[PDB]
Design a protein around this ligand. Structure first.
Ligand code: HEM
Ligand SMILES: *[C@@H]1O[C@H](CO)[C@@H](O[C@@H]2O[C@H](CO)[C@@H](O)[C@H](O)[C@H]2NC(C)=O)[C@H](O)[C@H]1NC(C)=O
Ligand code: NAG
Ligand code: NAG
Ligand code: NAG
Ligand code: NO2
Ligand code: CA
Ligand code: NA
Ligand code: NA
Length: 595
């Protein structure tokens, strides 16, 4: 590094070296370096940051500053020319359920968050950014190109605030700026429990010694729990329907209500903790609240790791799974567990897997009611459609029986995200997630497409003809090179996602390498990885081996018809069985005769 020891929140970290449980922060996982993978630290840099000043200024900031002798294109122009499409017909993934998309977003939220600069206080600064489109300090607005329809309806820009960074802010260091990871790098259910002590405590039911998570007191789903409401104002979930007045959920991760299927899977996970905490209390009436909370927590962390490494990563990485994530050979304390800055963009492949609609299905997997299918844009920050329109069950059936979107070089990101995104504090369904992704690549100082190709041992196309061959597409390579005059300048998010998918996978060679390395490291560099000797007993592991998403549904909803392989495209009733035919988590090996 340029100057080490610039980590302000490094201290106040006590390591009980015999504790059988993870910290909330992720401190004390690595014994020799105890901050490694802990929250509220710098994202790791796999390659030096690239900024137009070599330190923090993002490419695209200064009109008269080139990248490699060319102007970088406007993020929104890249979005309009390359990313957008009109026809949703034929865009669905014939072999991935909608759950495939949704598990991706859940795993992402466990691993990484780079919060926008902390400028919540009411200020003319928001006005200078949103109203006047003035680029300065944290405001780095997404300017509309000529002939952008949004010019006619929304003004000259979309507001965009720079990501927060480590080390004091105005006293910025002379090392290049590093954005923060606000959650734990470990795959540890931090999205359920939180990554900070305050929130972890607020989420818990301390009113009784049962090791329960707090549940909603104002609303229930046929006797099953909802998460508590976030009772701080203003609330974006209230803002999208001021008649319903249904706030956002409060969970371990601040983004839990961003869309209704994310809030859905959070509700399943919360329910599973309290189900585990109740069953643990029955098997061990002696155990106190703290031990019931910790033991349920450790079980839920192991469930998330198994679904992710056994069911999810193999059908993302396809042929490349074995090359980057070979069979576990145990905990390696030399491995860096930190999430990389580049991974936070590589894992944004899910955005091209989001389809244009969400469905509510009844017990026969037929349309639930007469508004059963809803445009996705109406479901950002939407809790009221869960609380007041049928609970979780209909949305869970949609997750099983509907398909993910397939990424397509011609049809990359649905207009529901590309033109109609709602951002809290922006009060309009008018934002562009693709343009935001590209602006954020530049904000975070990302090296370009060919730097990452090099990193991954892959060819670095220099010509139109070279880029055609790597993308296997003539027209997409021409459109990219018309905006970015050299492949060296292509932003990693659009470059990575433009590559044709590997055999049996859903990402191309570059993303398979960036994702594969990151997931290898979070497994190998985790002292509390479930399969690491000593973390669980052998008998605990033979039990954990039989977890499944279908089982999580069976145990936490009144859905009684599930598929055996919940990530593949499943149709009702042919691919569906009764819950009785799905393996159970045998909790008999957590029976502690402790006398
Ligand atoms: C309807 C579904 C989804 C919505 C509405 C959504 C929305 C967003 C938004 C608004 C951001 C922040 C953009 C920024 O300011 O830079 C974001 C970031 C991100 N999204 Fe998505 N997304 C969705 C699905 C997914 C999926 C399916 C995945 C993965 C499979 C994913 C992975 C990510 C990641 C990794 C980030 C960066 C998180 C970080 O800060 O470290 N998203 N998403
Ligand atoms: C705001 O949410 C309300 C409250 O759920 C929605 O209305 C319910 O929805 C329809 C009427 O449009 C009926 O099926 C229910 O009987 C309504 N209940 C109440 C209290 O009115 C309303 O549609 C939502 N509005 C918007 C603009 O999203
Ligand atoms: C906490 O647990 C008690 C006893 O089980 C229950 O009655 C109460 O509603 C719970 N509180 C919250 C906020 O979840
Ligand atoms: C542990 O990780 C280091 C880091 O590069 C690696 O070189 C080494 O071979 C690994 N050893 C074991 C036994 O896992
Ligand atoms: C569908 O995907 C699964 C993995 O989820 C795979 O084993 C199966 O062969 C695929 N089926 C088809 C028809 O492509
Ligand atoms: O999940 N996005 O805020
Ligand atoms: Ca985590
Ligand atoms: Na809090
Ligand atoms: Na969000």
């Amino acid at each position: 590094s340029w100057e080490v020891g610039c980590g302000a929140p490094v201290p106040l970290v006590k390591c009980d070296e015999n504790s059988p449980y993870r910290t909330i922060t992720g401190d004390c996982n690595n014994r020799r370096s105890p901050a490694l993978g802990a929250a509220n630290r710098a994202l790791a840099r796999w390659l030096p940051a690239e900024y137009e000043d070599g330190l923090a200024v993002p490419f695209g900031w200064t009109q008269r500053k080139t990248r490699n002798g060319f102007r970088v294109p406007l993020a929104r122009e890249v979005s309009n020319k390359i990313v957008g499409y009109l026809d949703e017909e034929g865009v669905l993934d014939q072999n991935r359920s909608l759950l495939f998309m949704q598990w991706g977003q859940i795993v992402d939220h466990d691993l990484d968050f780079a919060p926008e600069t902390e400028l919540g206080s009411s200020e003319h600064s928001k006005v200078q950014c949103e109203e006047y489109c003035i680029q300065g300090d944290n405001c780095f607005p997404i300017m509309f190109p000529k002939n952008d329809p949004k010019l006619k309806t929304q003004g000259k820009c979309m507001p965009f605030f720079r990501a927060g960074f480590v080390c004091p802010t105005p006293p910025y260091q002379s090392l290049a700026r590093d954005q923060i990871n606000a959650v734990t790098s470990f795959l540890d259910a931090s999205l359920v429990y939180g990554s900070e002590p305050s929130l972890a405590s607020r989420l818990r039911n301390l009113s009784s010694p049962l090791g329960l998570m707090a549940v909603n007191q104002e609303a229930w789903d046929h006797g099953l729990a909802y998460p508590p409401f976030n009772n701080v104002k203003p609330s974006p979930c209230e803002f999208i329907n001021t008649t319903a007045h249904v706030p956002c959920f409060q969970a371990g991760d601040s983004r839990a209500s961003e869309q209704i299927l994310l809030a859905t899977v959070h509700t399943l996970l919360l329910r599973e903790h309290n189900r585990l905490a109740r069953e643990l209390k029955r098997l061990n009436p002696h155990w106190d609240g703290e031990m019931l909370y910790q033991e349920a927590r450790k079980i839920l962390g192991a469930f998330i790791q198994i679904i992710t490494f056994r069911d999810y990563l193999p059908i993302v990485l396809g042929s490349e799974m074995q090359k980057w994530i070979p069979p576990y050979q145990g905990y390696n304390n030399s491995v860096d567990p930190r999430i990389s800055n580049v991974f936070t963009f590589a894992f944004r492949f899910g955005h091209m897997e989001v389809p244009s609609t969400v469905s509510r299905l009844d017990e026969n997997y037929q349309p639930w009611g007469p508004e059963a299918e809803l445009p996705l844009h109406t479901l950002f920050f939407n809790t009221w459609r869960i609380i007041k329109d049928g609970g979780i069950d209909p949305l869970v059936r949609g997750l099983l029986a509907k398909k993910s979107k397939l990424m397509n070089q011609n049809k990359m990101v649905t207009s529901e995200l590309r033109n109609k995104l709602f951002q809290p504090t922006h009060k309009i369904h008018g934002f562009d997630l693709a343009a935001i992704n590209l602006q954020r690549c530049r904000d975070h100082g990302m090296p370009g497409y060919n730097s990452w190709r090099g990193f991954c041992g892959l060819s670095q196309p220099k010509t139109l003809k070279g880029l055609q061959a790597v993308l296997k597409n003539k027209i997409l390579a021409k459109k990219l090179l018309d905006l970015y005059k050299t492949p060296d300048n292509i932003d990693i998010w659009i470059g990575g996602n433009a590559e044709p998918m590997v055999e049996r996978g859903r990402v191309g060679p570059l993303l398979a390498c960036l994702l594969g390395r990151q997931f290898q490291q979070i497994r190998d560099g985790d002292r509390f990885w479930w399969e690491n000797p000593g973390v669980f007993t052998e008998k605990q592991r033979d039990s954990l081996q039989k977890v499944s998403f279908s089982r999580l549904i069976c145990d936490n909803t009144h859905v009684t018809k599930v598929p055996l392989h919940a990530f593949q495209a499943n149709n009702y009733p042919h691919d569906f069985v009764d819950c009785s035919a799905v393996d159970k988590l045998d909790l008999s090996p957590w029976a502690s005769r402790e006398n």
